[PDB]
Protein: Inositol 1,4,5-trisphosphate receptor type 3
Organism: Homo sapiens
Amino acid sequence: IAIPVTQELICKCVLDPKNSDILIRTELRPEEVWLTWTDKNNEHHEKSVRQLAQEARAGNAHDENVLSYYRYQLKLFARMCLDRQYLAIDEISQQLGVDLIFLCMADEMLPFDLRASFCHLMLHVHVDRDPQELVTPVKFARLWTEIPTAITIKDYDSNLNASRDDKKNKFANTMEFVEDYLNNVVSEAVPFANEEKNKLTFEVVSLAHNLIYFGFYSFSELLRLTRTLLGIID
Amino acid sequence: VVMETKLKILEILQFILNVRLDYRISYLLSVFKKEFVEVFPNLDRIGEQAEAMFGSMLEVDDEGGRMFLRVLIHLTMHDYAPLVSGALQLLFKHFSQRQEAMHTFKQVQLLISAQDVENYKVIKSELDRLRTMVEKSELWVDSENYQIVKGILERLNKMCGVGEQMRKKQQRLLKNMDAHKVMLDLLQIPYDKGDAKMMEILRYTH
């Protein structure tokens, strides 16, 4: 459970601009993302995340170390954005947008642990905010006019969409990525064999659960996802 | 991690089943409305439709419900207590679809009268505004926000109404509108002693 006092103190201390050096900065440029970091000395190094992963697979010690540092920084940011702590959620959102996080998430060449960290950051930063709120799947008060003479799956989905507040969906790409990843996982002979893949699977399933409880999915999409989830279990 | 993801999937499946129950209730309401409008612009036909809706398309698994049962039985054998409890609950609730559907349908509220529609609209707006204000509690723990909250509380208090015949309907509508949850969440807001506006709004909520 998040501790508001220490969390706020750490937010104030870490996000202080005077401590901007200790944090690696990721920038999206024409479309690839580059990480820029300052070593213990007053020197700056900028390199592509894909290149960092390539050399880490090769066996470079410094590149692996900086990748691990970035992963732990992402974990710290995600922990800082727990229980809707906005003083840091806004800073992370401005520093890290939806598009950049999704780009880092979808790519498969990057290590699984980093993808899981990005998924956790996405869940704790953007999924849970003011516009999103828990929705009861069953409602007891129904207007006489709103009842349709003929009801089907498509009509029910249209009614749910009408009930939805935001016409524009910022997580459609995330939802498609989640569906594709779950389909790929169920396609695997062993759903839970690789330790690294298990963490990413846990992050994506948690993201799907939180999106579902927030009403982001339609009935047809939920029904389709049901079979894939059951195949994942067994 | 495997147990955690399995538990999350179980929760997702429970939500899916709840949505299916909601769709079934909507189907019953639509059939009843169609029958009423056709006959009075019959019982056997609607009964046959209701019996037939229960298990094709509204299937949790493509195997006709078998795969769900095998998955639940397999999960019940795991050592993780929460997973076993969830699997047992889902298995028990899987064979009580008709009972749950009828129980949910028995509590359906229509709000036919225009006055009922106006009450629903105003109550929904006030509850949404109150919940939005409650979410941003830190912004007004210690401005016009207090006046807005007081006005919303007074409007809801007036909406409660008078008269037993009207009071029963108003209370039923409020209960169906999930006002208790938001009001109790407001009551749980952190407070500092000595803020007169705060005890005033607390008394209004009480």
Observations:
- The interface with chain B takes residues 130, 133, 136-145, 147-151, 153, 156, 192, 198-199, 201-202, 205-206, 208-209, 212-213, 219, 222-223, 225-227, 229-230, 232-234 of chain A (CB under 8 Å).
- The radius of gyration of chain A is 20 Å.
- DSSP finds ten helices and three strands in chain A.
- The CA atoms of residues 46 and 184 of chain A lie 33 Å apart.
